[PDB]
Write a protein that binds this ligand. Structure first.
Ligand SMILES: CCCCCCCC/C=C\CCCCCCCC(=O)OC[C@H](COP(=O)(O)OCC[N+](C)(C)C)OC(=O)CCCCCCC/C=C\CCCCCCCC
Ligand SMILES: CCCCCCCC/C=C\CCCCCCCC(=O)OC[C@H](COP(=O)(O)OCC[N+](C)(C)C)OC(=O)CCCCCCC/C=C\CCCCCCCC
Ligand SMILES: CCCCCCCC/C=C\CCCCCCCC(=O)OC[C@H](COP(=O)(O)OCC[N+](C)(C)C)OC(=O)CCCCCCC/C=C\CCCCCCCC
Ligand SMILES: CCCCCCCCCCCCCCCCCC(=O)OC[C@H](COP(=O)(O)OC[C@H](N)C(=O)O)OC(=O)CCCCCCCCCCCCCCCCC
Ligand SMILES: CCCCCCCCCCCCCCCCCC(=O)OC[C@H](COP(=O)(O)OC[C@H](N)C(=O)O)OC(=O)CCCCCCCCCCCCCCCCC
Ligand SMILES: CCCCCCCCCCCCCCCCCCOC[C@@H](O)COP(=O)(O)OCC[N+](C)(C)C
Ligand SMILES: CCCCCCCCCCCCCCCCCCOC[C@@H](O)COP(=O)(O)OCC[N+](C)(C)C
Ligand SMILES: CCCCCCCCCCCCCCCCCCOC[C@@H](O)COP(=O)(O)OCC[N+](C)(C)C
Ligand SMILES: CCCCCCCCCCCCCCCCCCOC[C@@H](O)COP(=O)(O)OCC[N+](C)(C)C
Ligand SMILES: CCCCCCCCCCCCCCCCCCOC[C@@H](O)COP(=O)(O)OCC[N+](C)(C)C
Ligand SMILES: *[C@@H]1O[C@H](CO)[C@@H](O[C@@H]2O[C@H](CO)[C@@H](O)[C@H](O)[C@H]2NC(C)=O)[C@H](O)[C@H]1NC(C)=O
Ligand SMILES: CC(C)CCC[C@@H](C)[C@H]1CC[C@H]2[C@@H]3CC=C4C[C@@H](O)CC[C@]4(C)[C@H]3CC[C@]12C
Ligand SMILES: CC(C)CCC[C@@H](C)[C@H]1CC[C@H]2[C@@H]3CC=C4C[C@@H](O)CC[C@]4(C)[C@H]3CC[C@]12C
Ligand SMILES: CC(C)CCC[C@@H](C)[C@H]1CC[C@H]2[C@@H]3CC=C4C[C@@H](O)CC[C@]4(C)[C@H]3CC[C@]12C
Ligand SMILES: CC(C)CCC[C@@H](C)[C@H]1CC[C@H]2[C@@H]3CC=C4C[C@@H](O)CC[C@]4(C)[C@H]3CC[C@]12C
Ligand SMILES: *[C@@H]1O[C@H](CO)[C@@H](O)[C@H](O)[C@H]1NC(C)=O
Ligand SMILES: *[C@@H]1O[C@H](CO)[C@@H](O)[C@H](O)[C@H]1NC(C)=O
Ligand SMILES: *[C@@H]1O[C@H](CO)[C@@H](O)[C@H](O)[C@H]1NC(C)=O
Ligand SMILES: *[C@@H]1O[C@H](CO)[C@@H](O)[C@H](O)[C@H]1NC(C)=O
Length: 998
């Protein structure tokens, strides 16, 4: 333990400069957030003829609002008034720099950021989504890729530093190449009947599955008695894997024997472990077993440390935290319950909280433990748990990944067309038509029916567009030929899209438009943007990179599908059909009915006299192996996993109302899943990704990917920038006075005085606060005037001494820009202030933001900040290319959503600001979930299929006949997207991580 703990201390040492840089960026973004939004999360709709609010529909939070136009609107009779309290428990806000650093830490680790993004966009305005795009790319994505890329070197640095029976045996040993095949076929086929049980079986299907189970039991037991009466029972217990198969057969025998219907459904699912036998002929699953075994083997010390840390922090939490969680629980419990769901009143629950912090969900509890106990203890406990857990897990994952993996006239017309198709203006003209045709889809949104003219313009536009693209096709055919055209392999995209469009337009010619299949070809018209992939060279090179790696993804996806099949079958054994419940539903809000009225489905059928009561099911349940795959993806991505676990542990037998934590220990099912599925399948996936990328790069003679040919030239320039050590010593001035300023500014003392004065300006910035006072505002403005004068004095003194040498350097140009911006901003405020036309206050907050450049002046002497920022700049080209491809994907998916899901009812994730009725709103939701954040929130109103959730007989909204989504289409829009973004982003990581190494 000591040898490895010393290495962990070294890994903490290596975080030296990254901690500095993270603190600096977190602070700058804290000041930006504090400036722009201070006191905005306080705007809440309050009625008017104390305070009278109205809750947000389907929740109990007070409604957040705005007086702006794209900010968020109150219902009738509700004026957006700024009030005293903050949203959550008064802890999430931007009102002062300390809360601002809290919120920007929440954004760096991406814990429940989707909710803060919702709130600040709802309060200040959609346009401020530019802040989160910019603090999630720099905070979350980038500042994690510094941690992952410095731990790795610390761990590489560590490692690199160091008679009649014998006649029965005569056909006992007849195990030829055809018997083994029988065993494999039996394994697979038995798994296929285990993967075929569901909830509502009629008895006959259950009986068939039973007979099949018994047959496969006796088959494998027969195999075992054969083997024991084939070798000698001495050496039979010497092989590694025969012991495993024999323990499985004993457990199967016992489960058959002891007879209860569903008896300990873990014992009925224990057979599934047999698939691991199919690893002799499946080398990738052999490597998965190699990884797990090493995790508990040659790397046992690291997992021992991790277990020690989790046990210690669960204990400390229980002892310090626990008593007050008991009696203060009315202060953190849900509206109609009696205990909080997540608390620290016993070792299991304390461990569950420490685990959920290890997953990454570390704030939402902190608010509660601060509302129940002391605040300093909560902050220290949770934040030390977080840093230490997400450091030991990170180091263990790196170690498993690193060592364990890395062990005549016709000829003339053809020729005419042919010279023309290559001519540069021709290509650019076609690209232009693609850009307009793609962009014209964004105008086809919900409201287009009430715009009687824009529609017709778009229709004529589409007709001219099908013409123009068909003409390009025929030009390219009689240019190239039928034989070369198709072989190129980018032309098939164009031909398919053109055929789809020429089915659609013809269907608008005839009366067969509303025949459902052609109306399902039409919806495909959202792939028109995809014609852009070929024309842009950067998207082309990135697509080549991804298509080069689709094979390896396919192997690992097969292994992941088998392995999650195991857990989905366990889930169907354990939970299937028990997620149902009753709910008294009145208006938009649903509460489980107390167990003193129901306990049964045959009690909702009786107490339904009012009609509020309805018998329902959770949207993402475990009733099938199919729905089990979705519930496993939601657990493995940690989104919507909580509504799952609550009804897993509430569960009882079938047709019975669920009880408050009547299955407390089913959380072990989800813990075990996350550990094995998430941690180890992900480790396997990333291992094959790195190996693939390494060999892929090495093939090309060790050049770069995601980068074009000209990007390599820009790279040569940037690389030659950050190396040039000598610069001409500047000449000394002649004039006596122009010599003296030269003498004074050029020493080190002036630089250090200005450095510390920037720091004192920062301190003057951090005191700024919502609703402070009048006097403090005035005094801070006077002090601000003192700095803008001194920094002007600094620049003018530089100019007088260094006339042109100044304008040679770059940092001199930067602080020149910020000096002129600060003076201009003060002049702009002076004029546009109450002296002149009083526009919106919010303009003043944006104006006051020219000061933060003063802060960013600070990185001239800072080695660490400057070097890691130069690494970011070197990466930015490839980041641009993959950003282009991710943009195209977000764009296509935007139109798909905007055409398929606008009429869905407003519910959990879809409200009057984040929905799919417009290109702004749809792009908002798609960006929220590019990071997979909150995607279960949007998907939930899709799966609606009737009362109480949707009204399928609505007179208006001629869509799915009412406010209902398409469950088949949600699960494939939302699931594939987060997989495509996942694989797109993964290639964004490989860019920067391979930039830090250099
Ligand atoms: C939930 C289920 C998740 C995982 C269960 C994995 C079961 C793997 C069985 C391995 C059987 C074995 O024995 O493989 C022998 C081979 C060959 O043996 P040989 O040719 O050298 O002779 O060994 C090798 O090749 C490589 C040696 C790798 C040893 C793998 C050890 C896997 C143990 C997993 C248990 C982890 C805790 C589970 C807690 C559940 C609650
Ligand atoms: C999406 C947005 C994406 C990115 C935005 C920021 C990306 C650009 C960051 C530029 C920082 C920079 O270019 O500096 C670094 C260079 C380094 O030079 P070196 O001699 O140390 O070599 C380094 C020695 N080696 C070779 C070992 C590395 O310095 C120089 O080139 C000096 C010349 C440049 C002077 C003006 C550049 C700085 C202006 C603004 C930077 C502010 C960045 C803010 C980032 C967010 C903070 C919250
Ligand atoms: C800010 C966001 C991104 C930063 C943009 C620039 C980042 C790129 C860094 C490198 C660069 O491309 O730099 C421009 C180059 C620096 O190369 P060099 O001359 O040292 O090469 C030496 C060769 N020799 C001696 C012949 C000159 O030429 C220069 O000097 C000009 C560099 C001056 C920097 C222009 C960027 C100023 C824009 C905004 C400033 C921030 C104000 C608002 C604060 C944000 C509010 C929240
Ligand atoms: C290797 C191990 C590494 C461990 C690193 C993590 C260690 C974390 C230590 C944090 C220590 C915090 C000390 C101050 C906490 C006690 C003061 C306190 O009252 O806190 C709570 C405050 C808000 O209080 P309130 O609601 O206004 O009620 C105040 C009233 N007087 C009362 O006591 O009722 O709430 C606040 O003051 C907000 C504070 C936000 C701080 C954000 C810190 C980010 C973490 C660092 C990130 C970079 C890494
Ligand atoms: C490693 C990560 C792997 C991740 C795998 C994720 C796969 C999710 C598959 C979900 C399949 C699924 O949920 O089927 C179920 C849906 C539900 O429809 P319904 O009308 O409400 O009927 C409900 C009733 N309980 C019933 O199914 O009877 O039945 C449907 O109607 C949906 C049918 C089509 C679902 C196809 C999913 C393809 C996803 C592609 C994922 C890979 C992308 C690359
Ligand atoms: C670097 C920091 C980046 C932060 C970007 C954060 C986003 O910036 C917010 C503003 O740009 C939004 O628009 P304005 O505030 O300029 O509009 C004012 C004019 N009206 C709307 C009042 C009429
Ligand atoms: C290298 C080795 C690995 C390669 C894999 C190759 C192995 C091949 C495996 C083949 C798998 C084939 C599995 C066979 C399963 C067929 C699937 C069997 O179907 C049975 C049901 O369709 C019948 O349903 P019931 O008879 O219960 O009636 C339903 C109840 N009602 C509706 C009537 C009331
Ligand atoms: C890169 C290639 C893919 C994208 C191809 C270019 O897409 C550009 C569009 O985002 C331009 O904006 P919109 O036309 O969506 O904005 C208008 C929205 N309203 C106001 C009409 C609703
Ligand atoms: C009901 C159906 C609904 C379908 C909805 C989903 C639609 C998704 C469509 C995705 C299309 C993806 C297209 C990807 C095309 C990649 C195609 C990548 O191939 C590139 C080569 O063709 C380039 O040609 P060169 O001549 O430069 O060199 C040849 C290089 N090789 C080929 C010899 C190695
Ligand atoms: C998602 C991440 C988004 C990062 C977005 C990063 O944007 C930075 C780009 O502007 C830098 O691009 P370059 O200067 O390399 O431009 C060269 C490419 N062309 C324009 C010459 C073709
Ligand atoms: C309780 O009664 C209400 C109304 O009497 C039932 O609501 C009906 O639900 C069915 C399908 O479940 C719909 O076809 C009807 O249109 C609904 N009727 C009304 C008036 O809303 C509800 O199903 C009953 N709940 C249970 C399970 O007993
Ligand atoms: C209860 C189930 C689901 C958990 C997973 C089953 C695993 C852990 C069990 C089943 C069979 C067991 C293995 C069978 C025999 C051996 C060979 C011995 O030299 C080392 C231990 C080892 C390798 C056992 C370790 C534990 C084991 C692998
Ligand atoms: C439904 C589940 C339980 C059964 C899985 C069926 C498929 C995916 C499994 C069963 C047998 C497996 C194959 C067994 C043997 C080989 C040979 C190896 O060189 C490549 C992998 C390959 C080709 C495996 C791929 C995955 C595989 C085909
Ligand atoms: C199932 C439906 C919807 C899609 C089928 C479209 C197929 C037939 C189209 C789309 C892309 C086309 C392929 C693109 C790449 C090449 C180049 C070379 O390898 C031979 C032809 C081949 C392989 C094309 C054959 C036809 C092709 C495969
Ligand atoms: C060098 C000394 C003076 C301060 C060093 C840390 C400074 C820069 C920062 C860190 C945290 C900041 C504090 C965060 C929030 C508040 C609460 C507000 O009601 C008064 C200002 C005050 C108290 C800030 C003062 C400046 C501050 C203390
Ligand atoms: C919103 O505008 C109303 C007047 O219409 C005003 O009374 C209210 O205070 C405003 N709130 C804010 C924060 O702008
Ligand atoms: C919870 O908060 C209320 C005040 O809102 C308090 O009266 C009650 O006693 C608290 N919890 C306990 C200890 O039951
Ligand atoms: C259901 O909710 C309504 C209030 O909206 C209430 O009046 C009714 O008594 C409740 N019934 C039960 C027992 O759930
Ligand atoms: C339903 O619950 C009641 C107790 O409230 C019980 O007496 C009755 O037999 C139960 N019936 C069913 C449907 O099991």
């Amino acid at each position: 333990l000591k040898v490895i703990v010393g290495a962990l201390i070294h890994s903490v040492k290596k975080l030296a400069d990254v901690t500095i840089l993270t603190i600096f960026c977190l602070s700058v973004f804290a000041l930006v957030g504090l400036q722009l939004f201070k006191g905005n999360l306080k705007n809440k709709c309050v009625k008017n003829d104390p305070d009278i609010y109205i809750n947000k529909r389907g929740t109990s939070d007070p409604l957040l609002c705005g007086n702006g136009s794209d900010s968020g609107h109150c219902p009738d009779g509700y004026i957006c008034l700024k009030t005293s309290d903050n949203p959550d428990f008064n802890y999430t806000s931007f009102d002062s720099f300390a809360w601002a650093f809290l919120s920007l830490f929440r954004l760096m680790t991406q814990d429940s950021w989707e909710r803060l993004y919702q709130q600040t966009l709802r309060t200040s305005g959609k346009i401020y989504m530019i802040f989160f795009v910019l603090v999630i790319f720099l905070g979350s994505f980038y500042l994690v890729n510094l941690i992952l890329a410095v731990v790795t070197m610390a761990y590489e640095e560590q490692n690199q530093a160091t008679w009649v029976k014998l006649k029965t045996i005569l056909f006992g040993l007849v195990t030829d190449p055809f018997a083994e095949l029988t065993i494999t076929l039996c394994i697979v086929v038995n798994t296929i009947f285990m993967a075929m049980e569901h909830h509502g079986m009629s008895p006959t299907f259950e009986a068939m599955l039973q007979i099949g189970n018994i047959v496969f039991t006796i088959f494998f037991t027969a195999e075992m008695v054969f083997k024991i009466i084939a070798f000698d029972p001495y050496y039979y217990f010497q092989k590694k894997w025969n012991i495993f198969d024999c323990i499985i057969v004993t457990v199967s025998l016992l489960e058959l024997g002891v007879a209860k219907k569903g008896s300990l459904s873990v014992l009925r699912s224990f057979r599934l472990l047999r698939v691991f036998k199919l690893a002799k002929s499946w080398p990738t699953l052999n490597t998965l077993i190699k990884i797990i075994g090493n995790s508990v083997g040659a790397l046992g010390n690291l997992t021992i440390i991790l277990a020690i840390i989790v046990f210690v922090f669960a204990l400390v939490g229980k002892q310090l935290l626990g008593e007050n969680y008991r009696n203060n629980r009315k202060n953190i419990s849900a509206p109609h319950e009696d205990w909080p769901r997540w608390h620290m009143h016993d070792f299991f629950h304390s461990f569950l909280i420490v685990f959920r912090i290890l997953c990454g969900e570390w704030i939402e509890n902190m608010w509660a433990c601060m509302e129940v106990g002391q605040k300093s203890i909560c902050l220290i406990l949770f934040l030390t748990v977080m840093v230490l857990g997400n450091l030991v897990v990170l180091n263990l994952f790196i170690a498993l990944l690193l060592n364990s993996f890395f062990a005549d006239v016709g000829w003339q017309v053809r020729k005419t067309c042919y010279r023309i198709v290559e001519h540069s203006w021709f290509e650019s003209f076609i690209i232009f038509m693609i850009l307009l045709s793609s962009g014209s889809l964004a105008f086809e949104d919900y409201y287009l029916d009430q715009k009687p003219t824009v529609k017709a313009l778009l229709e004529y536009t589409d007709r001219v567009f099908t013409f123009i693209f068909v003409f390009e096709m025929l030009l390219k055919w009689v240019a190239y030929g039928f034989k070369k055209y198709f072989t190129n392999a980018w032309c098939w995209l164009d031909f398919l899209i053109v055929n789809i469009s020429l089915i659609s337009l013809t269907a608008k010619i005839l009366e067969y438009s509303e025949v459902a299949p052609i109306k399902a070809l039409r919806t495909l018209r959202a792939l028109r943007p995809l014609r852009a992939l070929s024309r842009f060279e950067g998207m082309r090179v990135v697509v080549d990179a991804l298509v080069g790696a689709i094979p390896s993804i396919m192997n690992v996806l097969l292994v992941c599908l088998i392995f999650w099949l195991i857990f989905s079958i366990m889930g169907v054994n354990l939970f299937a059909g028990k997620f149902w419940r009753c709910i008294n539903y009145t208006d938009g809000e649903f509460s489980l009915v107390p167990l003193s009225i129901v306990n049964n489905k045959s009690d909702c059928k009786i107490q339904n006299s009012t009609g509020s009561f309805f018998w329902v099911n959770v949207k993402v349940n475990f009733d099938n192996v199919a729905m089990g795959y979705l519930a496993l993806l939601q657990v493995a991505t940690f989104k919507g996993w909580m509504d799952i676990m609550y009804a897993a542990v509430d569960s009882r037998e079938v047709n019975m109302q669920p009880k408050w934590e009547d299955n407390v220990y089913m959380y072990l099912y989800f813990v075990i899943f996350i550990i094995f599925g998430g941690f180890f399948t992900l480790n396997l996936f990333v291992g094959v990704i790195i190996d693939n990328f390494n060999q892929q790069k090495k093939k090309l003679g060790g050049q770069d990917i995601f980068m074009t040919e000209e990007q390599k030239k820009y790279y040569n320039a940037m690389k030659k920038l950050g190396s040039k050590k000598p610069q001409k010593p500047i000449p000394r001035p002649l004039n006596k006075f122009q010599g003296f300023v030269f003498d004074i500014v050029t020493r080190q003392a002036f630089d250090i005085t200005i450095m510390v004065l920037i720091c004192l300006n920062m301190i003057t910035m951090m005191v700024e606060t919502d609703d402070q006072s009048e006097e403090k505002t005035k005094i801070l403005g006077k002090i601000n005037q003192f700095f803008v004068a001194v920094f002007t004095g600094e620049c003018v003194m530089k100019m007088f001494a260094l006339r042109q040498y100044y304008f040679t350097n770059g940092w001199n140009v930067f602080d020149f820009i910020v000096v002129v911006l600060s003076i201009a901003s003060l002049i702009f405020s002076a004029i546009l202030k109450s002296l002149q036309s009083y526009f919106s206050p919010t303009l003043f907050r944006v104006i006051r933001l020219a000061r933060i450049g003063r802060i960013l002046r600070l990185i001239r002497a800072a080695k660490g900040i400057r070097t890691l920022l130069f690494a970011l700049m070197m990466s930015l080209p490839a980041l641009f290319n993959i950003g282009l491809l991710l943009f195209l994907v977000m764009f296509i998916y935007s139109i798909f959503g905007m055409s398929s899901f606008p009429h869905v009812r407003w519910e959990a994730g879809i409200d009057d600001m984040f929905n799919f009725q417009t290109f702004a709103n749809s792009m908002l939701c798609l960006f929220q979930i590019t990071t997979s954040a909150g995607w279960d929130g949007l998907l939930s109103p899709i799966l609606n299929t009737g009362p109480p959730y949707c009204d399928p007989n609505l007179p208006n909204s001629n869509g799915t006949r009412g406010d209902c989504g398409s469950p088949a289409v949600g699960i494939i829009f939302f699931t594939t997207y987060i997989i495509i973004s996942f694989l797109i982003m993964v290639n964004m990581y490989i860019a920067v991580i391979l930039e830090n190494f250099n």
